[PDB]
A paper describes a structure:
MukBEF activity within the replication terminus macrodomain is suppressed by the sequence-specific unloader MatP. MukBEF is the SMC complex of E. coli and other enterobacteria. Its SMC subunit is MukB, which associates with the kleisin MukF (Woo et al., 2009; Zawadzka et al., 2018).
The MukBEQEF-MatP-matS complex is prevented from hydrolysing ATP and shows a state prior to unloading. Sub-classification of the cryo-EM dataset revealed additional forms of MukBEF-MatP with arms in different states of openness.
Residue numbers in the entry:
A (entry chain E): 2 to 213
B (entry chain F): 9 to 80
C (entry chain B): 1138 to 1235
D (entry chain B): 248 to 297
E (entry chain J): 1 to 135
F (entry chain I): 1 to 134
Amino acid sequence: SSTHIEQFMPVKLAQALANSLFPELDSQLRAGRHIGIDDLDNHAFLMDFQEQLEEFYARYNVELIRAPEGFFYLRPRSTTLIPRSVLSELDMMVGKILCYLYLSPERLANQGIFTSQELYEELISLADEGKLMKFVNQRSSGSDLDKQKLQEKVRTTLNRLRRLGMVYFLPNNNNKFTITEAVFRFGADVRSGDDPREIQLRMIRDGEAMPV
Amino acid sequence: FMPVKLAQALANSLFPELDSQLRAGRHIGIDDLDNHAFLMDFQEQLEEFYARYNVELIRAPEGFFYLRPRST
Amino acid sequence: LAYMEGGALRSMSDKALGALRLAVADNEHLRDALRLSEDPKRPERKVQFFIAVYQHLRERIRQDIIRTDDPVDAIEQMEIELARLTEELTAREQKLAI
Amino acid sequence: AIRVTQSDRDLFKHLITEATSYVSADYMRHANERRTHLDEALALRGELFG
Amino acid sequence: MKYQQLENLECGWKWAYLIRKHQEGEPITKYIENSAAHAAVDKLIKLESEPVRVLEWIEQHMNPDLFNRMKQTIRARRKRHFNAEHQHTRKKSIDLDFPVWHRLSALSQRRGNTLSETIVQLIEDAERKEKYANQ
Amino acid sequence: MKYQQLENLECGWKWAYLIRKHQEGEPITKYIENSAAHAAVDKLIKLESEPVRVLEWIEQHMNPDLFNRMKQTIRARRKRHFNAEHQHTRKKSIDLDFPVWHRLSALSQRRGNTLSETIVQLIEDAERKEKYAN
DNA sequence: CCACTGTTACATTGTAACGGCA
DNA sequence: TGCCGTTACAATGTAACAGTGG
DNA sequence: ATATATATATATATATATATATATATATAT
DNA sequence: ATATATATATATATATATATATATATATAT
């Protein structure tokens, strides 16, 4: 009959969109924030009405995607109604390193709580110090001023990732943080045991990762 | 539940583009005939929908619509 | 059941259907299959519905360790898990009291 | 967790037992009447031939 | 009693009959007031998955008119359901033109037997002619 | 064309048939999405008392696979409606036990006649046999 | 007696398959 | 071919008659 | 013929939720 | 190195719903 919700929208989708949690979750998602198991309320909300939200967001030409690790996010399409952006290469370095720390048992004593200094030390341990520094400044040759510049850049990238939900600052401390499973996306190019050059094409075709 | 007319307005195929442009701060005037008519018709419900975001859907005296963010 | 006669079989099938009606009200397509299974001209329908029931419980398995997709097999694993959780509950309530 | 797992186990048990009860009864019935009808038919066939 | 009465089946039949009658627009309820009738119908709807309570809903709100039609329809449905098992007990529905049916019914009422019996006698006379022709 | 078709009658027939099918659960519309199907069904429901627009509704939202069934149902409805005026043109429906029906259909298929023609011929032969004996 | 059951003879609506005809 | 009459069913609902046992 | 119990209306003030304004930390960019 | 933008937290005032206690008129036991 008329004046009846099923005329325009499914009942469960309307119930989900009328829930008190919908607005904060939608604003965060459109901002690019990933959702992990830690946000128990938001994660459960996404799980319960997961299908309604993928079909709703499809209207924006963006896929609400749940990675096998269990974290939801948004991937815009080429015809996205919501703009799209790509992380910096330094952001990739810090995200890969963050995934390593999530999987690294040596730092188990930290119990998941990490400081930016430790992250930088691990980054320089695994990466090429000076050749990575080259991107921070084209004229760097190990100068300690440029060293501090790279430290500051790493801190800034860490803050941006915090904005993306890959990392949480502690309820009182902004100098310490706890990693989230979302960081696993930084390894999507290696989660499959195949040739790297074919997986990169598969991902870029899927829209997962553009090149630089 | 949800208001019925609010569901009708949200379901309308014009809603995604208009919503994106509003959340981007764009002002919808009389020139955008379809969007302006849609907002005119469904203002009573979009005001509540965007007040759920602690934002105000304002129709200026000139007529154009826009979103004013609150402190929250 | 081979010994008994048709009357008792019919009566117990009716009782089983009565139990099912309560046990199936939540589901829509499974309930519809149960309803269709009532036609006497097509006994095979019955079996189909049975399959559906399995085809239902297969998808209700929670995580990988309980993926003994044979539903009758998952019962033992689930009972083991209930017993385990009982011990953890005892420990947890002791901890909460202290 | 205990509540959820107990509910799941009870539902599985009840569904499986009731489905088996519902189906196997009629299956055995049909088998028994099939045997009986075959036995009945043989005698008619034998008499008819002569 | 020739046909076994099954409670959980006849109850479902009765519930389906009531719902069908209501959706056809008939006043299954015994209530003339709109509100009580609507409430009783709503309760009956809730009773979908509990056929056992349908007998009680009948005893509380069923229209007094419907006892005869109810007891007729469920009886016929039971007979048909039990006869449908075997072909030789089934029934076949056919349509006859008015002149043909008039003659056949007059003949049957003359012989004091059912239509199937009259057809049996007729086809048997024809087959007797055929048999005698064959020998 | 033997029976003249009347729009205000056949359109009411079509509306009643579609409402019956929808109430029975049949998918009336071609829209898989539930929202569009419900909207079209509501349009139909509020469309009562209208031939010229129920026809258009059928043309625009009707399920492709139901066209033939609806057409033949309306054919049968028209024929029955026109034949139900006179007694001699009406049709009488009866139920025959399966063996009797099997034998009668065997005869009808053998002789190429219809059930009515076969029974008429047989009754005439029975009367002729009576006269032969009498 | 009275009630409940089994059975027959319809009606009512829907559907698939033939066959005629533009 | 696609419409249009026509047949032979299927499924369900009812009235009427005949039985049966309490 | 009386006084107490009831129902009604009213102001009091208690609490919640909202919305505003200011201070703070601090992360960016020239 | 510092101007500037942004997010968060707290205090403060508004507006509304609601429970409490009292005042007034009527009903009914004494």
